[PDB]
Structures are given as structure tokens and as C-alpha cells.
């Protein structure tokens, strides 16, 4: 459709819905371009869906709910987490109208600190999608970078192992290449082995990057404390909260501690909620 910036996300649970409102507020506080948010409807709570028109009127954004049913032929995922990961990567060509030329996935737990139109304008050199690589800058976490040894090191041949927390999809090129049909057919064949695609949303594009190119985004597009150094935080365009296998610190504790403006957005959205309620 007509918005300059089009973002979709997936959220399941009260905690992720609370963070999704914060992510949306952070996008609008950093851009003057028109924005439309797209929601994978079936995982959201009724209260979240009822509150979105109030967020839209307060922050000045458009929105649309997409309800796409998992195709009968396509191998299902019994685990809700894996089903949600399937919705991130398997249906990019069918979730959005043919008129939409580009969409960006932003994780529900992200904090945006840049004008997202800079990602819309980032050149992809013919790639149907662009992902940031996993950071190598936090050196003390090298033992946990599973992609630097074993299966992935041999498979990648020096190519980056990309994180799936943020990605830009040129829907025109994605369509042109039949990337959706190709990703669903590879997923269907690979998923017959239950050990394959452990990190479904991330492993599938990384696996297919020799035939479905990935434009490797600048590292500054995605900063996560687990893999990225403190020194590179000042250059981060977006901040992602991702699992830390070494510390196992809780999600809300990480959010409040890392990002000074997280509490500001959280309190601002709670103030908007009290204003609408009364
Ligand atoms: C959105 O538009 C406003 C208003 O034009 C911009 O405000 C300017 O902000 C800079 C600092 O960032 C100030 O030095 C200017 O004096 C402001 N101008 C006015 C007229 O208020 C704002 O920067 C814009 N934001 C984005 C992300 O484009
Ligand atoms: Ca995340």
C-alpha cells in the first residue's frame, strides 16, 4: 500500500505485547515518514487488538491485521514458538497485498533508535532480503558462537550467520524470484528430520543464502548485548533483546537495565492507557 515505512512483527503473550507497544512507540519517536504496522492477528490477545486504534491515533500510524491460515500440505509445528517462527519466514509473499513493495520485520522486544526509512532506502543489490550478521565483537562469548565451529562453519564457507530479529524484505524481488515457494518447499523437505532447523526463522534463510541471496546489512542495524560489545552500543540503530546462554538474566531485567529509554516508553504507553480508560 501507500505508507513509506511498513513494519510487521509477531508477538505472543502479555509480556511480548507490552514490548510490542514499546517497539512501535520507539519507531514513531525516530521518524517523520508515514508508517504502517502489520500484525499477525491470530497470536494477539483481544485487549491488544482493542488498544491498537488508540496507539495508532496517539502516535500517528496506520495498521492492518493479517490472518493467514497455515496451508494443509505444509508440515505443521506443534510447538507454538516454532509455529510463530514459521509465520516470520514462510509466508512473506502471501501475508501482504501485491501492491506492497517492501516490508521490514522488527522483533517485538526491540528498541528502535533510528529513522526506519534508512532501512527502506538501503541498497540490497538484487537480494530479496537483508539481515544483519550475528556480532563477533563481544569476544568473551566466542565459546557460545555455535556457528563459528561444526556444521555451520563448514556449511557457510565464510558467509555470515545472520540474526533473524530484524530484516528487510524487497517484496517485489522476493516475488520475482519465487522465494516464498522455494523457502516453503525447502522447509517442508528439511523439517521431515525433527533435528533440522533448530532456530527455524534464522536457520532457513542462512541455509538458503547460496540460492536466495541475503544482502548483509551493516552491523549497526542490530545490536544485542549477548553478542555485541558495549563499545558498539553508541552506533546501534536498533537494540534487540536476545537469549544470553551464559547469564540467563530475565527479559524485563535486561530491558530496564540496558536501555534508558525503555522505562520512558513503558510509562508513556501506561499513561496513554490510563487516559483512554478514564
Ligand atoms: C521531524 O520533524 C521535526 C520538525 O521539523 C524535526 O525537528 C528538528 O529537530 C532538530 C534536532 O533533531 C532541531 O535542531 C530542529 O530545530 C527541529 N526543527 C523544528 C522545526 O522543530 C525532527 O528532527 C524531525 N525528525 C526526524 C527523525 O526527521
Ligand atoms: Ca528479540
Q: What is the resolution of this structure in A?
A: 1.8
Q: Is the dihedral of CA 82, 102, 215, 176 positive or negative?
A: positive
Helix, strand and coil content of the chain, in percent to the nearest 5, comes to 45, 15, 40
Q: Which ligand is nearest to the CA of 255?
A: 2
* Residue the block writes with cell 503473550: 13
The response to whether 240 counts as a known ligand-binding position is: yes
Assign 110 to helix, strand or coil.
Answer: coil
Q: Quick one: which H or E segment has residue 218?
A: none
C-alpha cell at 14: 502479555
For residue 269, list its beta bridge partners.
none
* Distance between CA atoms of residues 139 and 227, nearest Å: 8
Which residues, chain by chain, have CB under 5 Å from ion ligand 2?
107, 109, 165, 240
Q: Which residues line ligand 1 (CB under 6 A)?
A: 30-32, 115
- Domains of the chain and CATH, by start: 5-277 (3.90.550.10)
What are the Cα distances from residue 87, in Å, to 43, 64, 109, 267?
Answer: 10, 16, 17, 30
User: How many CA atoms are closer than 13 Å to the CA of 174, on its beta-carbon side?
Assistant: 27
Separation CA 164–CA 200 (nearest Å)? 10
Q: How far is the CA of 115 from the centre of ligand 1 (A)?
A: 12
Cell of 38: 502489520
Q: Of all protein residues, whose CA lies closest to atom 2 belonging to ligand 1?
A: 32
109 is in an annotated binding site: yes
What is the C-alpha separation between 99 and 111, in angstroms, rounded?
A: 28
Q: Which approach determined this entry?
A: X-ray
- Other CB atoms within 10 A of residue 207 CB: 19
99-102, long-range: CB within 8 Å, 24+ apart, which pairs?
99/1, 100/1, 100/6, 100/171, 101/170, 101/171, 101/172, 102/6, 102/168, 102/169, 102/170, 102/171, 102/172
Amino acid at each position: 500500500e501507500h505508507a513509506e515505512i511498513n513494519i510487521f512483527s509477531v508477538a505472543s503473550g502479555h509480556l511480548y505485547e507490552r514490548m510490542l507497544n514499546i517497539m512501535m512507540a520507539s519507531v514513531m519517536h525516530h521518524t517523520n515518514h508515514t508508517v504502517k504496522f502489520w500484525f499477525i492477528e491470530q497470536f494477539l490477545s483481544p485487549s491488544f487488538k482493542d488498544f491498537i486504534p488508540h496507539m495508532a491515533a496517539e502516535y500517528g500510524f496506520k495498521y492492518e491485521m493479517v490472518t493467514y491460515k497455515w496451508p494443509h500440505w505444509l508440515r505443521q509445528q506443534k510447538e507454538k514458538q516454532r509455529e510463530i517462527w514459521g509465520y516470520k519466514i514462510l509466508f512473506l509473499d502471501v501475508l501482504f497485498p501485491l501492491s506492497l513493495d517492501k516490508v521490514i520485520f522488527v522483533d517485538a522486544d526491540q528498541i528502535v533508535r533510528t529513522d526506519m526509512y534508512d532501512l527502506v532506502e538501503h541498497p540490497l543489490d538484487g537480494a530479496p532480503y537483508g539481515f544483519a550478521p550475528m556480532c563477533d565483537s563481544r569476544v568473551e562469548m566466542e565459546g557460545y558462537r555455535f556457528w563459528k565451529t561444526g556444521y555451520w562453519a563448514n556449511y557457510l564457507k565464510g558467509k555470515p550467520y545472520h540474526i533473524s530479529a530484524l530484516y528487510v524484505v524487497d517484496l517485489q524481488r522476493f516475488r520475482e524470484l519465487a522465494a516464498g515457494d522455494r523457502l516453503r518447499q525447502q522447509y517442508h523437505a528439511l523439517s521431515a528430520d525433527p533435528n533440522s532447523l533448530a532456530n527455524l526463522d534464522q536457520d532457513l534463510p542462512n541455509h538458503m543464502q547460496f540460492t536466495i541471496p541475503i544482502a548483509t546489512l551493516p552491523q549497526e542495524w542490530l545490536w544485542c548485548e549477548t553478542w555485541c560489545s558495549d563499545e558498539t552500543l553508541k552506533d546501534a540503530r536498533t537494540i534487540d533483546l536476545c537469549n544470553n546462554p551464559m547469564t540467563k538474566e530475565p527479559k524485563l531485567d535486561r530491558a530496564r537495565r540496558q536501555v534508558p529509554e525503555w522505562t520512558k516508553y513503558d510509562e508513556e504507553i501506561a499513561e496513554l492507557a490510563r487516559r483512554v480508560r478514564e
